[model samples]
Target: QFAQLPVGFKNMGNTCYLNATLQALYRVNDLRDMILNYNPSQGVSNSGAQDEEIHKQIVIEMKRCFENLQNKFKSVLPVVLLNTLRKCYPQFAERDFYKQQDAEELFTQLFHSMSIVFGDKFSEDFRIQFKTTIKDTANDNDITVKENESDSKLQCHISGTTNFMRNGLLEGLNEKANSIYSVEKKISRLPKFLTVQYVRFFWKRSTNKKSKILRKVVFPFQLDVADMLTPEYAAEKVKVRDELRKVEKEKNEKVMTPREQYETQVALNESEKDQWLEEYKKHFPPNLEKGENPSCVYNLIGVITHQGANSESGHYQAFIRDELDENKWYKFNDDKVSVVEKEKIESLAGGGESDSALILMYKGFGL
Candidate 1:
């Protein structure tokens, strides 16, 4: 049997932001495997002698952490990575040791630092691209749509408590062009990985600090974005999705016979065909820019949550989808880690200032 995996990391005072963010990224199998196996000497170099030194340290530390993760070591004190991030991004420089920083920003800094180390050789596994467009809703006679971005964006924003993930993402699909003008967004590029931030915090003018929104927003374990895509994009995907469904059925039917049907059915179930589905995914691929339509489905991989009242005061934790069991999960509350059933994830939605989903990470799931 395999060694038991650790759920959490030891909190170095208020380094919850660093601990939780790193844990989530560590759960990314491809990234983890690559970092663990990669050699720094063969790695792409940095800008200068000093930067090259820091960059080398960053990759070395990341690989060390990955190695620890594989050994099922628990409670990482990532001072090495933390110092590297501080050197890379001055914003992460500890102004106050006890003061908490946003995990989102820290997570972003980690990726940015890695980008410096990996340079052009960086894998796109963590990058999600989005195509954003804006159409004028002015009273003028002319009606022209403006494309703000030719390349797909990486992340989307969400808000409100009593909404689903789809509702929050759809909010960005259309919006007022400005204070006086209105516009709509049409997606032209969709990423293989999707990064979603729960817009649950804002500055309270009266309190003069960032306040958390205690709305109970429910997000799905699996996300479908076929409806969110443009007509042309969705249209192409819908056709392909249906084709995959047909293929799945045909494959199962071929294996179904009266004597062997029972075991055959179990073997052909959705989860049983991961390799089969992965092959089709490789062939179809989710490249909207290439005019190829793959399934616009995504499977939840990580959830970063905030506990307590405000960003500066709350604690940060991460829940990553367990690699051994898709339905199985583990909750990482700083140094306190434990097994949690999939049903426990729903509790993160909020009844108070307790843990609420702040950042959700999803990987593309092709049919």
Candidate 2:
């Protein structure tokens, strides 16, 4: 029975909650330090106080919980499940999976150090869209498409779903994921009402066969980050990054040269603090020209709620741009979510896309 089944990592959880959390957090700090100073990206140069990731965020509290549990109660879990889960959040299940075949060569390297979900598959959906929409640019170049839709292509942008089931698939000869990384099941764009009992095998190669299966997906609420591929948002992001660089330089100066960096650091901190908020506002600006076109405008707004609209956030009545700051800067001349679009988004994400979604990506990401 075990032979046919998949394999996973062996986690350590001998310590009690608090102690395990502390121990695990210490390990996370070590790892974060490694990544922060990890050359290619290098660490966020010393903060003189603590690792950048550990400062005033849930990350520190989370690591503490994991190490404490491992040392005290002994709960075995995925590496991220115990602590340091910035993305693989829930860390239970239900996140995107990478098919073994996609990176088959890298499997042996991950056999021990990582968990492997066997029978994973990766179908090329986004690739097709990218090819059609974008110019034949090289890989190193940024992923961007042309303007005016001279080639009106379907550029799919997704966000605000915890269970980002981009890799979800129906049960079949392959039961649950059993390898290091589960495969993202890709179902060809089928009619919303389409139903099938069996899997649809795609093509096959010298390595492994590929296929698609239908699986009803209820996406998790996420922070809607606007796809920077758009012209307006892209320009705003470029400008904001420039300003942020100046602020980051000032902050970094404090660690190497405290006396010299202190005065400048204080000034930088004052305006540099709301970096995320300012970035969102500049790139997202709720009020753009709405009368122009609803479809075009929908790609420009940003909308996020206090909590998830699901079990976490109960209240609905999606907020519009005007409701947030009462500024006429928001576009309302045309309704982005027409009755049809609203129903479509609700059906897909199990929630409605506020008008803000039309112009920006509002990301509250936490449930």
Candidate 3:
């Protein structure tokens, strides 16, 4: 008999795929190095809670299922291949997966191809049989997660290339990635193997530059747009009432991890100052061309003539900071930023006064 998925507690589905994916995990031939440190939790252990054996198994299935994902669906989002496996896969979209014995039964519950988690492996010749069988009697179209072959996408060659001009490291990151992609295309089917290596290189470069000014130079901050405070831009706030509302309600009501809430506060407040800044950068940048800082309009509400309308939160709640100045770097003391941030946010949101005779202030743009 085949090994059944490991069981911990909670939902029935966890028990379903856990064991099968575990088998696919250590079962892979040459790729154990890639997953040498893998582990997943939630099982029972005398010390506290965790099954090390079960942990290794989860890692095993992770990539197995990853390899099983559809190349077409995987193309749009190269990174999503893993994300699809970790967070979204299976017929439930947001729910965990359960193994079914027949592909026929799968389609009845499975609508989107993503729900198939792991599909049966096939020879290029069996492509026809693969589709036909899985379409009907296939049992548990979930990931087959075998090590017989590497993913086709993993061929070393980089997929697509675009050209652009750059001054210094501006284009440096991409150039290196493309070069590696070209080389990786010739090797294994693990596409991400090369891409992740590329990201690590860039991430390393960002680490050193993350000093006094260069902190976000590599990670550069982004705004949530939900904080956009200008009258015209503030009109696009996301209000809700239906399915979207239900989803949003679920998201808000769901308990967040400690890190989630902390980082969320930072993200939630990023665009608090975007529209004001983007407006200035676009239309009024010339006025400040003399290097003469403009009035505190970035934090200043335009004259009362504009009336009391709000700004768009950076067009969708996805606001990202272009740079930090009059920013939210310090929010998190109370509800958001610290006391100092509160003053800055309120004063600016309320339209504060700018001093031309002050010490140097660059709005944190230099980095």
Candidate 4:
């Protein structure tokens, strides 16, 4: 009852990789919605045939593609978007019918292209700030802790996976380097949209190829990051998060008649509005202001998967959450889109690397 979901694009020869990645990104509702409504008619300059020109063209084509998706035009190939990308970024402009490309690589290019256009408005939506502490270790088990000279958004490295996302990310930093140093990481500011790359593929120097990690990294439908936040920052969010949980549970569990539903919706609207205003008011003066609260949580929405052992020669597909139903999902395998079971998605936990999730896109919970 929601609407016509984006129709899957036809694979142009070995372009399943690109198709899957594009579909996955399309499922990122906010991004697609924003781009679809982006007014290219206003954001143009006098300079002709330059970076700005190409950027405007990219945005226009991008908007057109989303329009096609919304219309459920599934009968044709998606050569327009592909050709536009080639003209814009010659790097992905590779024009080989037999060549297989990496889905992760294409998705990154897609993300960066959109970022270049909308960075002014939504930079903080995807950028994450991290505070890293490096401590020195001494002989005879003596240890001294020291902090890094500055905080940075350069990168937050994730070492490995331990099935669950939060647990794996936290455990990833719990280690010693060279038996003489230990490194610790904490979230200074959280992004509204968190882009997490599952450590699945790596270049194997010995084999002269890229290999898959085939580990069973079972991520969650909902992620609570309270434990990973700075102690001071976490306090600000706990109260609201708890209240949100209660409200969410009540909405999901309680059976309401028409009148009851209407009343509940009104009350929930007021509650959410209050929370938003409180947050805006709280984070202005250092103590009044804050990094993202420990109540920061995420809900998984889109997943990009690889269906082969190696990155270069794999089939790509997208498993996206349905907008109409939280418990429903759809798989876009080139042109063959189908409703899929949640259990099928869960099985992508990489027992033997048949279909491992490569990139996960999570939207902020309650957003």
Best-fitting candidate, scored by lDDT:
1
List TM-score per model, in order.
0.81, 0.21, 0.15, 0.77
Query: Which digits, one per residue and each the tens of the lDDT, describe model 4 over residues 1-367?
Result: 3235557878888778877777776777667777888897666433443566676677778778778777887744768777877777776666547467777677666666666677634454566655566566556355444433222122222344365655556765456745566767666566666767776667879998877777777778887776776675566555557766665665566487887887787678778656654554342224322223234777888888887777667688889998646789998888788888889888876667578777787776655
lDDT of 1 by residue, 64-134 (tens): 87677667665567778777767866777757675788887776666666666665344344443344444
Error of 2 at 79 (Å): 14
For candidate 2, the 10 contiguous residues with the lowest summed lDDT are 118-127
lDDT of each: 0.68, 0.25, 0.23, 0.67
Error of 2 at 130 (Å): 10
Root-mean-square deviation per candidate: 6.0, 24.3, 25.5, 6.2
Candidate 3 lDDT tens digits, 1-367: 2212221111133222222222222222223333342333422122221333432343444444434321112212123322333343344233324322211122122212211222221111011000011111233343222223222110011112311111111222222111122101111111111100011111125454311111111111211122212232222212211223343344346499887887777675666445333533442323222222122111211100000111100000001112334243221111111223333322221121221000001121211
TM-score: the better of candidates 2 and 4: 4
User: How many clashes does each candidate structure show, in the order listed?
Assistant: 5, 52, 47, 1
Q: Top model by TM-score, which number?
A: 1
Model 4 per-residue lDDT at 238: 59
Query: Which residue ranges in model 3 land beyond 4 Å of their true spot?
Result: 1-11, 37-86, 90-367
**Model 4 compared with the native: what TM-score?**
0.77
Model 2 TM-score?
A: 0.21
Cα-based lDDT at residue 174, candidate 3: 21
